[PDB]
């Protein structure tokens with residue numbers, strides 16, 4: 269994201285969320301990383317969209333971590 273504290277990732281695999289709170293995406297989408305919320309999940313959002321939620325770290329290539 270534009271906020272320099274956010275991170276940046278590119279989806280590495282498709283991800284379908286298990287429920288609403290999990291954010292689905294496809295490989296190749298750029299994702300803003302808001303927070304690494306635990307040892308396995310990020311909170312993030314997709315630029316240009318209203319898509320936002322959590323997803324597992326496994327499913328992205330992290331380019332820049334959030335601060």
Ligand SMILES: [Cl-]
Pocket residue numbers: 286287288289290
């Ligand atoms: Cl869930």
Ligand code: NA
Pocket residue numbers: 283284285286
């Ligand atoms: Na899933």
